[PDB]
Amino acid sequence: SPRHL
Amino acid sequence: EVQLQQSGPELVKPGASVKMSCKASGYTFTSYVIHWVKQKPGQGLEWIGYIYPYNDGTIYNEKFKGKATLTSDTSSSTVYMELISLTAEDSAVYWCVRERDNYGVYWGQGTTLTVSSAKTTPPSVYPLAPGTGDTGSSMVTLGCLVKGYFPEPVTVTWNSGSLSSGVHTFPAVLQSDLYTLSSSVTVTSSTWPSQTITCNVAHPASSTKVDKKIVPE
Amino acid sequence: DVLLTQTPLSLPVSLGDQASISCRSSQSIVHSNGNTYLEWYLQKPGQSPELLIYKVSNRFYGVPDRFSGSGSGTDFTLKISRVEAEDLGVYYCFQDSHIPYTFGGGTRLEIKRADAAPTVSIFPPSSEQLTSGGASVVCFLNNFYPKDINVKWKIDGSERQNGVLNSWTDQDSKDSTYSMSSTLTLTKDEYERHNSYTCEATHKTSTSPIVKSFNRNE
What we know:
The complex is a heterotrimer of chains A (about 5), B (about 220) and C (about 220). Chain A is low in regular secondary structure. Chain A has no helices and no strands.
């Protein structure tokens, strides 16, 4: 899961 | 309240470097990554990379490898971006932005970087009052012309911010390495000249603040 | 990189009507975990961007249900129903399914309000500026719509084109109008060799220009 903005 | 507070605007010569800061408060600093985003006129938004303060791990946009370096200092709850070998292409607004949670996404206020060999020049602030013999009721428009400064930004307020509606501050335009900007304010004729109307001009790069009271001609 | 292409570049929409904008990717943007991490942001004039939609179709906290996202594969759409004045700004799609994260090029939403004529005001050079040897005549053309407008400067009734600098504000989120500033700059010496200074504003709202003038001889 990406580290979101 | 979550807050990211960025360092002030910078003018740097081509070939040199600059380091910009982003101070975080109101949450656990090591829990969230902070990204940097470039906003250059005509070029939308661009993601540079992020740093994870918990372990100083970084992920970079390959385009900015060898240009940008991100660092973090937990004891001061601050992250930094350093840009080297600067060119005019690096002129932009740079944002830091904290990894979002369920309540919001938390952006700094941005830092304006200008890369140029042109010289810092303070502004001339000129009052704009109606000519002698004209107009009348029931509103009156005044202004300030802010001419001949470098670099951006300049801020303008009216009556220290007490006059905010009816204000139009126009984007600055660059000519021959100097910027010109103007700001108009429209008040009821019963306000001016009975009460004072003053434009407050700030030019951080030259450490200048100017108040210009608008007086009838 | 994943390239995101937004259309249209700009979109005028009246209050209460629907806006629909598209974002097209250069490749599939399905993450390894099966999710499609496509987001929509709005950047209002002078502000940082605000997140509207995440994972293609989920509304973020505090975003009204009249913002809806859809799409799959390489075609994504943001639909804005019942547009409000505060919706103006640049809408960006954004992906973080793949590194580097990328933004689309942006779509500017313009509020189409009823036409409005400018309020025009002319200002002679300040005495302060004259002491430095320069002379700027300023006309403000305020709170008009649409944005396109033409200013003609005349000195002693003859059109002057050199020395004019024009700047427009962004669209105002309260009344949906624009304003523009036009500055004619001459030397003090040339300024004091002429009498009448005129700015004429031609706008869609009238076939006759709005004329503001002053004579140095008063």
